[PDB]
């Protein structure tokens, strides 16, 4: 029915069959990425044509390929061989993770390094980390993963408590060869365990927490049709899921009176990078593009009722492809529910004698993913008043190192001899705008202070200014918290009853952006992270701020390249890319398991409605 429905196991199996029939999926082939494509602009298509895009890896060393297929027509739309040294390697395969430890286990250099530390190889876990791009010429064109070691004293031990510093190895996961093993010197391996379920560390568990029961006698207020179409308190949207981006929101619209008014055509976290700020050669190459390199959606957790999602929850169980094209379901991977959100509006008027109070609520769509030591929760919220918000919740176990004897300017101490390198978690929200339709524009709004004098004799006046971003070349903006800078997306052709263009205002948290030196590899590979806001003209092939192939890919693609087209964005089909993140200087409180920290952004209506859109909310 709806062209925005979630992919079904059948569609994935059909893609597999189409590829096989086309001779593109032999026994040496592996699916590194597979996702459904959004319908093309303009519903000119008589019927629906479900298309899937796939990245095909070859374990024998042959060139990989990018393929698009129409499962509807059972055809291969396009198939191109990729030159990875130029355009980038495919995303890391889940099957390649175990390869790093396995290969290193029999390498003489690795074994000698472990013996020098009196470590039993059988107990040494190796984290399969993306390699990035640096000065190792032999890595160009090859799929390389770098490994950092952690000791696990026993099956249920938390290896992160025992980092093996001064050692790092590089491995070619295709030819199965250890290219390099670097040992800069022995560091004491932190002895304290970090087992947060061990009574010896947790102590007696608290018995002081009484239960909080959240229930809905008449069920939830939202309805789900077509498997993923949501309707809740005037909001309308489709909940999609992609193995790379995770949860994607489609066709966010608000029912104002008798008309369905669009606001955002597509919303997603198009990239997220975790750059480390420790200059040690052991970790200075460390930059994890969880979204682009690992594909966060792929590792989404199955959420337990009453534990991960509390209350009356409706689940979606998205299906993705395994490495062979077989469908795999992520049971209860997406939670959907509405939750009370305190007071919405309130006023006790003396003159009228009327006391008015109304409560707020928000629709929540979320999922949680795990990538090695990190665990991230992605939350999208829709409020009664028209506000749209995204929130990222970062938790898990901090990535560790040894804590140098004389201290460090780039690492904090968590436990005796245990360090945690400084790093950032930076996201990029891609908002394909559709404020009352596709004809949109963006204005940067700053508060304007005024000087006391003629026309402002008492010096109390203050105003604001709005600057339209007309071409992509002038649409790379930075935050200015001091002047209350925000960005307004409006429709110059759609005006409210007061003759003003309708719009939505993006409120950023104004957290620090990418800290790395502008001449660094990461500053180029994650150029999007250096500025708070980017605006581009919509294009079918401009999906990620970092390009299609991020793994071991130098600069050359992504937002910087798109912006160069300097297209018209003043009253056109535009896309907003907002960078926002957390700068983490680990605290002792983050060890052995870190409490959630958050970051996000929100958009509030700005003259979108003709008056408050919640006057029809009952007292109840």
Q: Which of residues 551-590 bind a copy of itself (CB under 8 A)?
A: 583, 585, 587-590
501 touches a copy of itself (CB under 8 A):
no
292 is in an annotated binding site: yes
510 touches a copy of itself (CB under 8 A):
yes
**With helix as H, strand as E and coil as C, how does 486-525 read?**
EEEEEEEEEECCCCCEEEEEEEECCCCCCCCCCCCHHHHH
The encoded tokens of residue 327 equal 């469908």
Torsion sign (Cα): 180, 181, 184, 187:
positive
The encoded tokens of residue 101 equal 């430890």
Whether the CB-CB separation of 486 and 507 falls below 8 Å is answered with yes
Return phi, psi of residue 16, to 5°.
-55, -50
Residue with Cβ nearer Cu ion (229 or 584): 584
Give the residue among 151, 170, 148 at the shortest CA–CA distance from 159.
151
Which segment (7-15, 111-119, 246-254, 302-310) binds a copy of itself by CB under 8 A? 302-310
584 is in an annotated binding site: yes
Residue 117's CB is within 10 A of a number of other CB atoms, namely: 18
- The minimum distance between CB 267 and a copy of itself, in angstroms, equals 21
Q: Which of residues 118-157 bind a copy of itself (CB under 8 A)?
A: 125, 134, 150, 152, 155-157
Whether the CB-CB separation of 276 and 286 falls below 8 Å is answered with yes
- The minimum distance between CB 8 and a copy of itself, in angstroms, equals 26
Return phi, psi of residue 206, to 5°.
-65, 140
Catalytic (active site) residue 383: no
373 is in an annotated binding site: yes
Residue with Cβ nearer a copy of itself (160 or 538): 160
Among a copy of itself, Cu ion, none, the one that 258 touches (CB under a kind-dependent 5 to 8 A) is: none
The encoded tokens of residue 264 equal 């955002």
Three-class SS state of 11: helix
Q: Exactly one of 8, 70, 72, 370 binds a copy of itself (CB under 8 A); which one?
A: 370
Give the residue among 548, 7, 5 at the shortest CA–CA distance from 291.
548
Q: Exactly one of 591, 599, 600, 601 binds a copy of itself (CB under 8 A); which one?
A: 591
- List the catalytic residue out of 170, 374, 383, 562: 374
Catalytic (active site) residue 290: yes
Binding mask 540-579 for Cu ion (x = CB under 5 A): ----------------------------------------
Q: Exactly one of 23, 141, 512, 556 binds a copy of itself (CB under 8 A); which one?
A: 512
Q: Exactly one of 27, 122, 205, 259 binds a copy of itself (CB under 8 A); which one?
A: 205
Torsion sign (Cα): 548, 549, 550, 555:
negative
Whether the CB-CB separation of 578 and 443 falls below 8 Å is answered with no
208 touches a copy of itself (CB under 8 A):
yes
Length of the chain: 620
Q: Exactly one of 21, 463, 565, 572 binds a copy of itself (CB under 8 A); which one?
A: 463
User: By rule CB under 8 A, what count of residues binds a copy of itself?
Assistant: 156
372 is in an annotated binding site: yes
What strands lie across the sheet with 486-495, from one edge to the other?
314-316, 334-348, 355-371, 374-383, 388-396, 594-605, 501-508, 486-495, 441-449, 462-469
- List the catalytic residue out of 290, 436, 532, 590: 290
Beta bridge partner(s), residue 230: 224, 237
- The minimum distance between CB 150 and a copy of itself, in angstroms, equals 8
Q: What is the DSSP letter of 290?
A: I
- The minimum distance between CB 351 and a copy of itself, in angstroms, equals 5
Q: Which of residues 397-456 bind a copy of itself (CB under 8 A)?
A: 397, 409-410, 413, 415-416, 422, 424, 447, 449-452, 455-456
Q: Which helix (H) or strand (E) holds 424?
A: strand 423-433
584 touches Cu ion (CB under 5 A):
yes
What region, left, alpha or beta, does residue 470 occupy, with left being phi > 0 and alpha being psi -120 to 50 degrees?
alpha
375 touches a copy of itself (CB under 8 A):
yes
Q: Which of residues 68-107 bind a copy of itself (CB under 8 A)?
A: 97
The closest residue (CB) to Cu ion is 584
229 is in an annotated binding site: no
Q: Exactly one of 338, 432, 436, 443 binds a copy of itself (CB under 8 A); which one?
A: 338
How far is residue 601's CA from residue 594's CA, in Å, rounded to a whole number? 22
10 is in an annotated binding site: no
How far is residue 490's CA from residue 228's CA, in Å, rounded to a whole number? 28
Which residues make up the interface to Cu ion (CB under 5 A)?
584
Residues of the binding site for Cu cation: 423, 425, 584
Residues of the binding site for substrate: 288-299, 371-376
**Mind telling me the catalytic residues?**
290, 374
């Amino acid at each position: 029915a709806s062209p925005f429905r979630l992919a079904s196991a059948g569609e994935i199996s059909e893609v597999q069959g189409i590829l096989r029939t086309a001779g593109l999926l032999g026994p040496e082939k592996r699916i590194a990425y597979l996702g459904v494509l959004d319908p093309a602009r303009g519903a000119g298509s008589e019927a629906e044509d479900r298309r899937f895009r796939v990245f095909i890896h070859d374990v024998s060393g042959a060139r990989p390929q990018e393929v698009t297929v129409s499962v509807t027509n059972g055809t291969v739309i396009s198939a191109v061989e990729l030159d990875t040294a130029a355009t980038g390697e495919l995303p890391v395969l889940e099957e390649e993770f175990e390869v790093v430890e396995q290969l290193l286990a029999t390498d003489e250099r690795w074994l000698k390094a472990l013996a020098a530390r009196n470590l039993d190889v059988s107990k040494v876990r190796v984290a399969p980390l993306s390699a990035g791009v640096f000065e190792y010429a032999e890595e160009r064109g090859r799929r390389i993963l770098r490994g950092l070691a952690f000791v696990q004293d026993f099956p249920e031990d938390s290896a992160w408590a025992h980092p093996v510093d001064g050692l790092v190895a590089y491995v070619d996961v295709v030819s199965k060869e250890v290219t390099r093993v670097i040992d800069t010197g022995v560091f004491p391996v932190p002895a304290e365990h970090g087992n947060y379920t061990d009574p010896e560390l947790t102590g007696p568990l608290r018995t002081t927490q009484k239960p909080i029961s959240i229930t809905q006698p008449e069920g939830p207020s939202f309805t789900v049709t077509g498997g993923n179409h949501i309707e809740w308190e005037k909001w309308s949207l489709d909940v999609g899921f992609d193995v790379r981006e995770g949860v994607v929101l489609h066709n966010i619209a608000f029912r104002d009176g008798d008309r369905l008014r669009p606001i955002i055509n597509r919303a997603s976290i198009a990239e997220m990078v975790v750059p480390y700020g420790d200059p040690s050669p052991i970790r200075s190459w460390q930059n994890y593009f969880d979204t682009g390199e690992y594909l966060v959606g792929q590792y989404a957790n199955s959420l337990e009722l009453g534990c991960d999602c509390l209350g009356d929850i409706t689940y979606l169980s998205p299906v993705i492809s395994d490495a062979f094209g077989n469908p795999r379901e992520i049971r209860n991977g997406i939670c959907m529910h509405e939750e009370d959100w305190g007071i919405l509006a309130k006023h006790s008027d003396l003159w009228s004698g009327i006391n008015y109070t109304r409560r707020n609520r928000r629709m929540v769509i979320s999922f949680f993913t795990t990538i090695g030591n990190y665990d991230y929760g992605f939350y999208w919220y829709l409020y009664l008043d028209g506000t749209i918000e995204f929130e990222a919740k970062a938790t898990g176990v901090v990535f560790t190192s040894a804590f140098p004897e004389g201290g460090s300017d780039n690492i904090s101490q968590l436990a005796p001899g245990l360090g945690a390198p400084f790093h950032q978690h930076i996201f990029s929200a891609r908002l394909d705008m559709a404020i009352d339709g596709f004809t949109n524009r963006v204005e940067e709004e700053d508060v304007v202070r005024q000087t006391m004098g003629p026309g402002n004799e008492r010096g109390n006046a203050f105003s604001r200014k709005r600057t339209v971003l007309t071409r992509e070349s002038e649409a790379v903006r930075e935050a200015d918290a001091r002047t209350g800078r925000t960005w307004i997306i409006s429709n110059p052709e759609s005006k409210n009853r007061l003759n003003e263009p309708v719009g939505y205002k993006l409120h950023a948290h104004n957290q620090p952006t990418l800290l790395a030196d502008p001449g660094s590899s990461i500053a180029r590979r994650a150029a999007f992270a250096t500025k708070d806001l980017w605006v581009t003209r919509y294009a079918d092939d401009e999906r990620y701020p970092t390009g299609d192939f991020v793994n071991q890919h130098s600069g050359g693609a992504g937002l910087p390249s798109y912006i160069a087209q300097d297209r018209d964005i003043d009253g056109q089909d535009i896309v907003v890319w907002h960078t926002f993140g957390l700068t983490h200087f680990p605290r002792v409180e983050d060890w052995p398991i870190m409490p959630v920290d958050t970051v996000g952004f929100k958009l509030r209506p700005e003259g979108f409605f003709d008056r408050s859109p919640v006057l029809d909310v009952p007292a109840n």
